[PDB]
Amino acid sequence: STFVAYLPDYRMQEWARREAERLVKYREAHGLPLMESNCFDPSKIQLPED
Amino acid sequence: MNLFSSLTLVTLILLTMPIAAINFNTHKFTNYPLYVKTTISCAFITSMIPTMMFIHTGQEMIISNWHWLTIQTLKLSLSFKMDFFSMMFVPVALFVTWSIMEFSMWYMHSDPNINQFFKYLLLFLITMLILVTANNLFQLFIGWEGVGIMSFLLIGWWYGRTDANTAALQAILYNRIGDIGFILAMAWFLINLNTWDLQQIFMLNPNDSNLPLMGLILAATGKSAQFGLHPWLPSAMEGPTPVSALLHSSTMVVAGIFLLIRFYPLTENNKFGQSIMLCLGAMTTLFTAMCALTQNDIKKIIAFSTSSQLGLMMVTIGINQPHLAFLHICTHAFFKAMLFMCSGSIIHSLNDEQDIRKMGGLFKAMPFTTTALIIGSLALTGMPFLTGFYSKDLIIESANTSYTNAWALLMTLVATSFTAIYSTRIIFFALLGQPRFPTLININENNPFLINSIKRLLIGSLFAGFIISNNIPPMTIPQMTMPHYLKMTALTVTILGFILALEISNTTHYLKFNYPSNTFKFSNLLGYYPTIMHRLTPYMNLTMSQKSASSLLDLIWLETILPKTISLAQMKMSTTITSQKGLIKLYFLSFLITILISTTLLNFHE
Amino acid sequence: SWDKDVYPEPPRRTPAPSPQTSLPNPITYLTKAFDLLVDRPVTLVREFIERQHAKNKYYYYHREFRRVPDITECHEKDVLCMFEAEMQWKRDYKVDQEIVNIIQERLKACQQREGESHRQNCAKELQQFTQVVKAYQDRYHDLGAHYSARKCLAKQKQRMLAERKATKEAA
Amino acid sequence: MLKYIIPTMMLMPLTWLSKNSMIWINTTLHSLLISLTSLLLLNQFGDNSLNFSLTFFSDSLSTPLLILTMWLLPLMLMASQHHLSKENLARKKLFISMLILLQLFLIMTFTATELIFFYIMFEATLVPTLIIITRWGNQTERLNAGLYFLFYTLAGSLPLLVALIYIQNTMGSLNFLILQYWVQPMPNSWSNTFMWLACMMAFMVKMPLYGLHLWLPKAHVEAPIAGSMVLAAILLKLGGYGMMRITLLLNPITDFMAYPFIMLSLWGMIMTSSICLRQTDLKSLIAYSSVSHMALVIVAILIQTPWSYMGATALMIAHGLTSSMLFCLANSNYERVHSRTMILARGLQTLLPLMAAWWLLASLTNLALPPSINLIGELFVVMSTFSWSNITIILMGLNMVITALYSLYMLITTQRGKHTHHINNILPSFTRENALMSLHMLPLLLLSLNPKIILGPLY
Amino acid sequence: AFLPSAAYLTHQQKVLQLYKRALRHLESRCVHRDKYRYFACLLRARFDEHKNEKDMVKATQLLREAEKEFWHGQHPQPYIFPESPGGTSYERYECYKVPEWCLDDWHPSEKAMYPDYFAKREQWKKLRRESWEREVKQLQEETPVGGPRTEALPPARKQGDLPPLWWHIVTRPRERP
Amino acid sequence: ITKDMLPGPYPKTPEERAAAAKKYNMRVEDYEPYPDDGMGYGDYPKLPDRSQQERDPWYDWDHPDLRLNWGEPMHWDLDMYIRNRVDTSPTPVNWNLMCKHLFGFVAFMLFMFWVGETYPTYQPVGPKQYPYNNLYLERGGDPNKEPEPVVHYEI
Amino acid sequence: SFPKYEPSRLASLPTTLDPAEYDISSETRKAQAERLAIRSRLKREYQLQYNDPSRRGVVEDPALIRWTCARSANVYPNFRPNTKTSLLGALFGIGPLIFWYYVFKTDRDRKEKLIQEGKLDRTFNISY
């Protein structure tokens, strides 16, 4: 139980918080939106003709 | 800031510490119940300090101290909520539990498992203080299940008795139906609002919240023993008297009403949910009023009385008056706990007899119990300027001059009259008249524990309603401009009920015999509800479990279609194949027939 | 300590105590007792602990991930690039989840802090929560339990195809 | 994974070169040391799984099952050293070797990165289990229990292998790391219909599924205590692990295909709980409760949402621990009264107080009292199946009531009431039995503090 | 018709049991003692009016109509004694009625805390094990052919011996352990 | 135990019926097995189907908790008729009258609740008047959209 | 005159109101005689096996073993497939399965059809 309690950052669950703590402080500072609606950049993706 | 949270968490730690003390014993504990009682008194003072802090300033806190589990978007953290409800409920419950444990130290003196009894009572108090200070729905569900199973164990304390285990299982069943409602409400909240914390639920403020409110109403019907799911609370009085006095009267049974109190910003907008829950409260209080009208076992009478009180506070919850209902929560807890304490003293003084038909003449035999019982019955009936006046009269005044159901208001008035009727019935039969107990008299109440506990609860039932009603801050506009006939309605109805039941008690002295009517049997057999529902539905469920599920499907037919069909087919084919006579001529004839079939019919030579 | 910018808090305005009656409130006396009996020993012990910490100071760092090419520049059935794109997408998924958690914390803190007037004083937090929830739902929802970068790319392609169809039918 | 296979294989020279009566001590000590060293598999990353070599890899899903297996082996040796005290020394060594071999196959099953290797170990677990059931059982019906246990499973698993071989001729490889990137959508056709059936019916059989569960009440109540533990706590999770690995290749045909099995499990949980309400045998009651819980896990896997997967793995671990504890309780009562009737020995609280406390605690964890991991898993499956449809909660909620209607019943008939008068061989509780129940329960109560290690590979 | 010693209930026992049940229900109906005494005297008159009825079938029909009369007008919740079955205190202390043979499983360390009591227990066990064969031979020589007819046990008809099957009735736990 | 004491197929010949009655330790005239409709009961007797609460509580039972003797044939549904479970004690009131009374009570009060919901009660007052355009900004309205002007006049 | 009691399945007739109890014929007395004889013989055997000081174990009851064997292992050999059993099995086995399948299929179809047109409220539903 001591080994399980002191696991070194399991599944980087803490780290994903801390990086997010940086990232918001980026996009709130420069007026960017918090999250874009597209996961990937729309300029680098080609759609079939329809 | 560093004093509010510190004192409340040290209250929680101080209450949970004697469990760790009893879990690490080697010798026999020297006065463990005294240790638990002293711990609870210290915790009551430590909880009373932030109460006056909130009275002075109005400070509310959220203590999200332990981050437990982050699951994608949802975050579950150990969060404690300190608001008006927690700060006005925790010292009241702790004071009641202090008096209850002193009375139980007097009453449960001869039991060899008194330490286990006090550990169970402290575990129940810990689970309830988890529930009432819970911020998110997970912690509230933890406290819900904890108080439910602690009620199960304390009802089934005397495990050598059949009826105790039966009533405990019945209470578990009804509480699990309430859990179905709670789980449905939590499911809707997680799916639609993406949260379990109450802050985000109150912030988002959904409009089409009929389904979660119906789930919460079902949960409160399960927990607060309303109509449809009532009889577990009358049957729960098979356990010890302090267990009844705490759990089934003052603390545990108000958890559903507390849950509905906490969700008032959601039910403020809804009108359908308010109408349903007002109707359910009115049905509960009227049905339990007729059930308590003609009962003989005293604890059954007070069980139906406290379920009628629960119906009344649901009624005033349903008229969008939550804070008056919470004031009635505290007041009713006070006088109902003290009434059960007096009834337990009377029962213990009459050699474990719980029948009111073998009582009487105790007006001068036990004067202190007589005084406290009279004061409690007066406070229950609505004696002015007692504890019961400062909540019940405001409740009925708000229910009179409002846009409510007329039938529910009429039945609430009739239920008030019936509460007065059964209160003076208890006073007349249990306390007045002539003695009816056996000749060997061993009446004694002069132990310091019983006297001190009854004295403290008597001071509470005299002044606590006034003190709380003058200390709380306003939250809603009180109604004060009402006509004369609506202002004096509660007092007039209580007086008329007292007069009618006094006439009934006077006519019971006459030398006339009457055959039992249908109304008396309906009001005496608990509305025929435990006779029908506890005989029909278990029979149907168990017969469908045996004659259809066990014996028919999973023991015959599922055992027939898959394994036995192929087993018998393989047996038949094995007998058919190997039944040859061992003759060479037949074998070579079969060879010739095989060659004939292969040459012409199957075209294997192509 | 934490960051005051990513975890904002409005300026606090405590009114001064101006008592009217002559009765001494017990809160001030118990505050003095708490400051004498409790606050000073805890402060002294923590100061001793910090003094012991100051002799041996060591640092831990935040891990920095450089940018790798994403799934849109990976050839079909070439594992050596879609692998890195998949792990980068998983890291971005976790970062986005914690961003939504931060916004939820902001909303709950605003609702509890502003009291009974929370409906008017926390409109900005509610609108930021709505925007980030809409972005998260449009980006990651309905992918399934076996989510990957390819499923998210297919969902995005379907979304832009539907948007192009809708803006063509309106023009 | 070579650092765990080698000590497990070396356990057999330990148990064969030991002394005349020191086999149990040495095997328990070294298996507990292996269980201690098993905690090194918790090196999990938020994106990447732990890959050891070209054959063995460990995700966050296989790791709790591996830890549970290597923890269960010393408990198994402690449980199965009382009814074998009269056994021959060679037969005792053979039994210990059977348990060691079964554990070796189990810890080699979960780490297999190839589906063919996983399937080979998944069927290799059959032989020691069948041998244990048919040799070291107590009743006659174990021989019948040796058939229904066997020819069910192979009847599900012999078509599936063919389907797996088909993937070897279609995708070019069966490695799970490759198939996560080379997967293709499955169009709606009869061929893909029967391939879905072939790939799933083995895991429905071994879970089990309602209708196909007929082998489990027979193979649980004739088997010895070690066999009951290995069926209840580990061998029912091979189907769940196989489902979670194989659902990736069977998309998107599973959306309209999972309906009849979902209905079968959603009615089978009610049917098996109702059966539990009227069972006269303790062991059959525990078996049918296991059937109900695994039907719940089947529903959770089939609806395939992240909350459902999390609840499925949490329910798997919690049910394994709780069913193992209940089976050890039933074994202790059977060893004390020499019968399996529930109504025979009543009022045992007046004779065994600590065993009554263990019975109450096990029944508490059976009906998923919060904040245990049973409630965590069952709650998350309920949330996911409410997201799936708004009516299924009814079929959940009623089931919950019936659970609380039998577990406490399983308490009361065994613990409360007047004790029987003609039974006077009730010995006090041994230290070995109490040690067994504490070792069963204390990890289960401790896992409520940190449940994030049993929340699947997508936490 | 379920009795430990007899196979049936006679007419007299039926009348007496009906009278007892009717008087108990009448006491439950009227709370006060004087009203109960008045109506009990009235019921005693009603029962004494038909005492000397030599017609057997008329007595049977009177019994049937009296039973119907009692079933028509009985209390819905009659008074039950606390130790009577169906009472509030019924079988409550069965959780403390520990059987005696548990003392055979006590540790020798805790057996030394009560030396004289365990010496007397050893003497009792010696008496039981020396009288068991004598009492079973008494039972086997007194039971008629085809087994016993009733459940009544014979007494000890000799000098120095004990009545047969005396252990589990003498050594039963008390009502208040 | 031995083979010819366990239950078997349904008895047909009177000699088989007498043997089964002797095996189950009661009279031949009182031995009524379940009818052979193929439901799987076999030769198990059909007991008079009453709960254990109807037994004599003052008799010296071998199992006073369940009110059962030793060697007596058990009911097929003995786990249903224990004192912890369904009871078939004779009620003072007939079953049909109780059911009809309860249903009539519930239905009548539900109907009267619906009738009272149709015609509610109130007090002779107008609507409550709130300032600042019925508290448009305080109800969570957007500050950009100017609300429709609601003015309340003194009466 | 007086309302006669109606017997019910869950409310049996009272023992004192049974007309067959009041029969004083010879056959009823004889039946009670051998019923008491059988009960007395069984009780004598039980208490002879029960008061043995040398015995330390469970007094085995053949009735309990008989009941437990008849409840579980003696159901299939006494089963014959006929109209009644097949009708009951078809009504109880595949009836509820078909009913629940139709209910859940209709509900899921309605919910999905609401989802595609965008009428369903999914403003904050991001956990699934």
Ligand SMILES: CCCCCCCCCCCCCCCCCC(=O)OC[C@H](COP(=O)([O-])OCC[N+](C)(C)C)OC(=O)CCCCCCCCCCCCCCCCC
């Ligand atoms: C996993 C699959 C196989 C299952 C079987 C496994 C068998 C082998 C078992 C090996 C050992 C156990 C492993 C799991 C250990 C889980 C526990 C653990 O370490 O948790 C980590 C967690 C870690 O907490 P954390 O994650 O919040 O902290 C951050 C991490 N550290 C610790 C590094 C700062 O430990 C705790 O939470 C411990 C908190 C302090 C101790 C408890 C204080 C409160 C105790 C109760 C007080 C009273 C309450 C009220 C009681 C009322 C009466 C009932």
Ligand SMILES: CCCCCCCCCCCCCCCCCC(=O)OC[C@H](COP(=O)([O-])OCC[N+](C)(C)C)OC(=O)CCCCCCCCCCCCCCCCC
């Ligand atoms: C009587 C003797 C007492 C001890 C004397 C000696 C110690 C004196 C005091 C100093 C203590 C040490 C320093 C302070 C504590 C450590 C600070 C710290 O960061 O601790 C790590 C953490 C704090 O959380 P955290 O945020 O750091 O960890 C989060 C970790 N991840 C990100 C992985 C999730 O744990 C604690 O502080 C322990 C809390 C214990 C109290 C709660 C116990 C709960 C037990 C029941 C479990 C189930 C709950 C279910 C419900 C959950 C809610 C819905």
Ligand SMILES: CCCCCCCCCCCCCCCCCC(=O)OC[C@H](COP(=O)(O)OCCN)OC(=O)CCCCCCCCCCCCCCCCC
């Ligand atoms: C706001 C909405 C409000 C809606 C209200 C109307 C709907 C609900 C109506 C009530 C439903 C529950 C009541 C009926 C079943 C009660 C079962 C039970 O536990 O009965 C109690 C009984 C013991 O009672 P008693 O006989 O008094 O014991 C003392 C002995 N003299 O116990 C026993 O005898 C033991 C029996 C054990 C086995 C019980 C088997 C039956 C269980 C049925 C559960 C049904 C749950 C349905 C859930 C649906 C969810 C959608």
